[PDB]
Amino acid sequence: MLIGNATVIPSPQTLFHYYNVNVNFHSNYNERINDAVAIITAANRLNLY
Amino acid sequence: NKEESKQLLEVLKTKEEHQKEVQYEILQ
Amino acid sequence: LVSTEAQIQKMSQDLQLEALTIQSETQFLTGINSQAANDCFKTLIAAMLS
Amino acid sequence: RNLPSTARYIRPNLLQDRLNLHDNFESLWDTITTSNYILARSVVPDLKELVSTEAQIQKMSQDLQLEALTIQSETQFLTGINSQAANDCFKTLIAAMLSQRTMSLDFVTTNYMSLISGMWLLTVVPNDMFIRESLVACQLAIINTIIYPAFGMQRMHYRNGDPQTPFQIAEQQIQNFQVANWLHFVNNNQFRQVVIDGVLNQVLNDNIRNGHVVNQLMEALMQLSRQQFPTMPVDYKRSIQRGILLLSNRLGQLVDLTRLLAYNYETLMACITMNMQHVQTLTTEKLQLTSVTSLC
Amino acid sequence: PAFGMQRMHYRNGDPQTPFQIAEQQIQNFQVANWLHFVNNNQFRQVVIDGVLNQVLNDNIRNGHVVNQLMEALMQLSRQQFPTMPVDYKRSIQRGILLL
Amino acid sequence: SNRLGQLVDLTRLLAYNYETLMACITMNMQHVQTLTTEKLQLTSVTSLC
Amino acid sequence: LVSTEAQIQKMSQDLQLEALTIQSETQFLTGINSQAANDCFKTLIAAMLS
Amino acid sequence: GKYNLILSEYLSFIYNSQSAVQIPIYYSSNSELENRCIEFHSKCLENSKNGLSLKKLFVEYSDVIENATLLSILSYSYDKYNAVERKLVKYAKGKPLEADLTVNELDYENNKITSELFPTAEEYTDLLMDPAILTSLSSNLNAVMFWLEKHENDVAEKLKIYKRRLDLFTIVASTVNKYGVPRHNAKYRYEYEVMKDKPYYLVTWANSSIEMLMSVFSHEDYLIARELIVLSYSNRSTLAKLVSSPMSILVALVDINGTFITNEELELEFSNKYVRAIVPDQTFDELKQMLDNMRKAGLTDIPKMIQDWLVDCSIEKFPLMAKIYSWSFHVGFRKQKMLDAALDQLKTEYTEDVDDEMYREYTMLIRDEVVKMLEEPVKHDDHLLQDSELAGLLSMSSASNGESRQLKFGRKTIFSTKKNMHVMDDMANGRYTPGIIPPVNVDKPIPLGRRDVPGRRTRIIFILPYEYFIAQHAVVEKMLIYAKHTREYAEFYSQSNQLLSYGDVTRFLSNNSMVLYTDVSQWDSSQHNTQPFRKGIIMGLDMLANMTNDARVIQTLNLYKQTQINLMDSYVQIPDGNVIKKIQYGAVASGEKQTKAANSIANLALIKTVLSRISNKYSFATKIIRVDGDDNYAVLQFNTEVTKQMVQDVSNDVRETYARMNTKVKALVSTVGIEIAKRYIAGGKIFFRAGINLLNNEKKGQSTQWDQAAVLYSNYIVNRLRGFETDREFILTKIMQMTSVAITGSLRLFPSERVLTTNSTFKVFDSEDFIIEYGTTDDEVYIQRAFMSLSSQKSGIADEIAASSTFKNYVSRLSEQLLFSKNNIVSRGIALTEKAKLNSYAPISLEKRRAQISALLTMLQKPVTFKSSKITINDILRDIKPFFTVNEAHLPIQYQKFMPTLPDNVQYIIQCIGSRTYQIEDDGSKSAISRLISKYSVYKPSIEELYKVISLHENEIQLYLISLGIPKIDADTYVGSKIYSQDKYRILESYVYNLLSINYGCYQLFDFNSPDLEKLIRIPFKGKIPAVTFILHLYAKLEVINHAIKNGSWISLFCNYPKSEMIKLWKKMWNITSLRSPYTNANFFQ
Prior knowledge:
The structure is cut from a larger assembly and holds seven copies of chain A and one copy of chain H (1086 residues).
Chain A: H1 12-44
Chain H: H1 3-15, E1 21-27, H2 31-48, H3 57-60, H4 62-67, E2 69-76, H5 84-88, H6 137-150, H7 157-177, H8 192-195, H9 202-213, H10 219-229, H11 240-243, H12 247-250, E3 256-259, E4 271-275, H13 282-297, H14 301-307, H15 319-327, H16 338-343, H17 357-380, H18 383-386, H19 388-394, H20 419-428, E5 448-451, E6 459-462, H21 467-483, E7 513-519, H22 531-545, H23 551-568, E8 571-576, E9 579-584, H24 595-610, E10 620-627, E11 631-638, H25 644-659, E12 668-670, E13 674-675, E14 679-681, E15 686-688, H26 705-722, H27 728-739, E16 747-751, H28 753-756, H29 778-791, H30 796-801, H31 805-818, H32 827-838, H33 842-860, H34 873-880, E17 887-888, H35 904-910, H36 930-936, H37 943-949, H38 956-962, H39 968-977, H40 984-995, H41 1011-1016, H42 1026-1047, E18 1051-1052, H43 1059-1068
Helix pairs in contact in H: 6-9, 6-27, 7-9, 7-10, 17-21, 17-22, 17-24, 19-21, 20-31, 22-23, 26-27, 37-40
């Protein structure tokens, strides 16, 4: 009920912020996965029982 | 006095008897 | 945004209320404020994106 | 527990009435029925969860678009909507049907909502289960001011000692298929005597249980909404039709309630040892009809 | 109540939402195509640039679905409520006119 | 109209009581226009009705 | 008899009065009381006999 | 029209001298008759001012004596305020009483001589036995003796009561005359110099004893009085708490046959359900030990009364117990020291043997509850969270009484405890600093208050700075909002104005179910209110901080977090004589905006934590859990039927499962009953606690001699409804003696019956209990217009404070924190609005009310005023009356008894009509204007202001609403919506209800939506004038009911109200000038 002839678009700084944050999270996600996968595959190829 | 009080303790058993209790007690 | 009170004055005029009845129409005015329009605008979009 | 074969148990004597105390021992049968009624009241469940009583009345009020502060005067449609009567009715019906006790009605004819909420009751339950003069009065009122005016029929010409009830003499007058089948059900509604597990029982239709009678009812009422009241004004019609719209909107909940009562009643019928006769009784149970509208 | 029908007898755990059964109960061209759309409204799972995406219909984006809905509402506004009173008509029709 | 039958009954009752106090009459009773008249407020009829 | 006030209740529920309107139906209530029904019942019958 | 005769006889009795003269004054609404009254008045005043006999003229002017209306009576008589002894020598032939110092635990709590405990008056304090009430012992004794004289010739059962109380008063008066009368100062305190040669605890015992013996109506009452009066002279710390203790077990012994139910807060719906009573064996042994202590104290009759009932354990003879249960709370307070009262609580046994698996779970449940409370507002960014500072700054009026601090407003010095004023003081010197939360440590410990209630322990109160309130406000309000609809927060569930009176237990009580109920009032110094509770909340705040994006909110949250840090280590200023102790208390107690709901939470979490251990050995379905402050109860139903052995073993397991967390408890398990502080149930019948001491109070309020009489009468009415019934005539005697005023040594003034029971701001009681009385006459209107002309008054202190610099600074900071550039159009409005919440400050009220009394007094003396047409209620009823018609009715009996302790007539009403089912917005909370007020504030505004505000033009409404902190955009939107016109009727409903105590007292207990009441009220419907038909139906209901109460029989009604008068009254509606005092209300639920 309260709108007319005025458009709101995300500012590019907000976009870049959102994108960079998502980027950093995803890269953190993959790198820590790769870390943990390394330790697991290490420990199962060494009889650390 | 207190002889009758101990009798009050005794007579306050017969009243308000539950049924499951006497069943399990006969069994037990 | 358009002025809340003005738009809602138009709603009021277009409803022809009565001060002496219950009028289900009255409940239509429940929460036609600003600060919720923005809240809904944020909540919906953030939900649909997330 | 597992019990040995050394154990024992005594069987009761559950032999039915050798005396036929439902044949002219009416003061004792009154005592028995009253005893069973009041006993049965202590086992009807409480309605644990409901809808609040003021958040409903505002929906009803706004549906009707009523003058302010008629809530506390209760322009007669709106009287006695509260609980403490709905539960009372809920309790009374079940305890009475178990004890097989007739219940009398203290209502008003000015209050047409009472007449409207009496319909669901007087349909789902046979009429020989109540006491005669009360439901005779109520049916007479209903016929005279909701039904026959909706087709331009005359009001009535009723006789005190009349073999037929208004619903009997009404099934043939009016011409509607839906209502015809509704009234067919009404007139031919009755209990089913049947002996099961040794005990006699007054049983429901097996259609009443899985509630579909209410669909015939809705068909008739929706049709009557679609009619006109030529002899009468618009506001009168408006008031009545709103009064049944307030029930229409609660339709599905009524259906569920009907099924629940039917289920619990028959379930408890199973847990009866003394045979259950269908016989009118001396003393009754008062029933404000606002306690039906309330319950509904 | 506008087209003069029963309220409903709807189950809690119905395997159909009310709109699915109501797609076939009704007699109205606009609403029936609308309910068809509703039943077949769903996201599009598409992998673009490595990432998945829940993409809309490309008829939803450009608002045109609203024309089916609003045409249906115009063909509802013009209706009478055979069962229900005129105050109820007034309330409802006034509200939907605000939108 | 919602007290129709009751008014029929009332009419029958008046007729009965009329012909009953007529039964305790001996001097023949003529249909003649009298001098003086009895007033009658119709509010007093509605009440009765 | 019927109680005067309950009968007026019934008439009121059926008539749909309005407190802000010169109604014609407002004049239906003048003199509904007993002691007049009695008075009419006595006058009519006495006159028809005499 | 009878009270005044008893007043006259009292005057004749107390003074008795030839020199003792009695001087009436009258008034009349008729001009000619008024001039004849003036004449009579004149001649009487002259005659009085000439030592002439007044008794001669009284026959000649008989008309004035019969038809005119009285105000008051003066009395000129020479005396040196003694007279008690001069009457009392005859009534004191019994034996005096001897103390027993080896009864109370302490030494100084014995009733020994003052000088043996306070040799110097410089170290004396009467506060350990201060009655704390503006009424004298001499008043009480005078009342008693006049009562005794007048009830000396009745011959009935009434006389058997009179002989009993006469014997008691002989027993008392022998003891009193042994030493003498303590003499009151101007403040009704008792100094060292009168008590210097007498026992210290003689006064409270005396007052309390008077209160008891005046509440004797039966033989058993006489037994109680004889058995308490002689033992209450020595035991003063372990007596009401003692005898009131077995009741919690006794309620678990009465089989239910018939029940009452809740759905929604007053939905009653009786149930014929039967439930047995599975009592174990060892609880009888507990009871026997309690009775051994009871006998060891010196009790003979009350073990017998407790012993002979058990032969049947019937509920018909049981109200005696309930009666007894209220007599324990009418013996007085254990007014010991702040220190020693704390040391009842401040004994701790903290151990490193509890689980750690338990506290983490406890903490987590608290955390989860916090998140459930705060998910929505923290996320959707509500204005009230952002502007929490301004919100708290508005809601300062609803806070506690801060520590006394020296202020100065221009050219005066003030020692206010109101925290808004503290903030105002701190604003000037740059000290207003809400972001910097003060510490609470060695460098700044906390003061204390004591929350007392007889028959129980003393609870403690924090006395904080003004930042803590601000921090806790917004979050606790959102928590409350969550708690409005959560059922288990019993003190906080509502339908937006109600607390659940009659419990939620009786749904699922049965032979298969049980209930565990438990007192948790000592669990304040406990080991579970320290570290885990606060850290759980902190964790919840962390979650919530990660559940929002705004920065203002995070600032608020970090400050609240740090507040919880500071509350984790908290020291406490406590004096002891001259020197001051400061103690480590890193835990929780009352005295906070957060404490109540948070304690409810904490008890909920605690019981949820406890409740996961019965599950190791039993299968039950938790049907209900409830927590309300100092207690909590949970009901549970089993897969099978209950036995004694399962209750006993469950009880031992529960006790030990509390012991595993280092937690003391008197564990109580039952099947039918509970006992808690405010109410209790036995056999499906609700009883209540009647514990309000009359002649001894909790603490020292701020009211006058006047208003304390009204509160005491309200409490009398309440206690009467509860069951504890005192003789109403005594109360009336006290009311007249406390509204009597001494203008000189020999002048004394006495008001009349038609001033105290008349609807005004000065109403005190009613001529017929449970029934307000109205005015069909000109005269009640006449004096009401006069008193309404006088109610509106000024406070020069308030005027000069509002003209100071701090007020200006306050306004400036408000402005620039909200809006600017309307410095002469709204800011003045905001100042006028702040004035509306300065009046909460007590000395302003004292200035204003004492001014009101002086203005009142200068027209009580002299004749009366015409008052210029101002319409009130009695004008309306005067005009409504000539269109009524009564008829004899006959109602049946159809409602069930469930409150035996009521009078039988009250029950007869209840046994013919229903009990109430709703609760109308007496303050308009559900009104859409109030759902804005509940959005930007908590504040009430009183219905006087609202009833006026709606009547004005559309201009000053805008100013008035914007001035209340509301912005301009929503106010404009509110004016455009026109919902206030949809709220005239609700406001008027609330107005009339508040004026007529409809939601305050006996009429608060009644269903006006009834069908049974309605069929008598045959008012036909007209429509389009809601106010008239509303008020007509209401007044007719009251007429029928009052006729019923005073005469028993019933009637119907009829009102053919003409439209002409409808229209004449429609314009008289919204210009009413009337008002009722807050102090006169009597809430049955306190």
